[PDB]
Design a protein around this ligand. Structure first.
Ligand code: COA
Lengths: 153, 4
């Protein structure tokens, strides 16, 4: 069958999503982040390894540049669960969502320029580096971030 | 990974 499944984010499992993000990413988000993601439904899932929360993906919709883009705010799982196909599962999930309506031009995200393993993961699914924004992070080094975009339309 |  399957021992890696995805599941919803509800107000009952929100602190678990938040804990995960604290461990996985070197930036901290305040609770605006976690309030907004309660409203996007399918654009935010938790990843389970047998009812243990191991990672999550959280998205947001940007209407700008006359484009409707999907923005991946966070996608990740705890270190010992990497290279298991969990991130692919979550990415494929956001991709599966973008192509159930067809109203999307692109999907994009930010990746720190030192994070070579995230760069390799996204470029594998057809995200290209379109822009390198300098001093995008405030509190961490290196501060520069690539803009990885995948095209749909 | 989003800003800051
Ligand atoms: C980047 C990340 C999200 C991918 O998660 P993941 O679950 O380990 O990736 P998957 O197992 O689903 O996909 C693996 C495939 O993509 C590629 N890939 C993923 N990470 C890679 C890395 N370490 N370097 C090169 N190839 C990689 C591979 O070719 C791999 O296939 P393989 O296992 O047969 O070799 C994960 O490493 C992570 O959580 N990093 C910390 C969070 C983070 O920094 N997020 C910022 C951007 S998402």
């Amino acid at each position: 069958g399957s021992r890696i499944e995805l599941g919803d984010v509800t107000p009952h499992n929100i602190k678990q999503l938040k804990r995960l993000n604290q461990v996985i990413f070197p930036v901290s988000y305040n609770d605006k982040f976690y309030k907004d993601v309660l409203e996007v439904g399918e654009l935010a899932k938790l990843a389970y390894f047998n009812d243990i929360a191991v990672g999550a993906v959280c998205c947001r919709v940007d209407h700008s540049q006359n484009q409707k883009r999907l923005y991946i705010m966070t996608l990740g799982c705890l270190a010992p669960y990497r290279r298991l196909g969990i991130g692919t599962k979550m990415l494929n999930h956001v991709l599966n969502i973008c192509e159930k309506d067809g109203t999307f031009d692109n999907i994009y995200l930010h990746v720190q320029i030192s994070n070579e393993s995230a760069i390799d993961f996204y470029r594998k699914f057809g995200f290209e580096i379109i822009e390198t924004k300098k001093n995008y992070y405030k509190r961490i080094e290196p501060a520069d971030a690539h803009v990885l975009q995948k095209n749909l339309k | 990974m989003m800003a800051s």
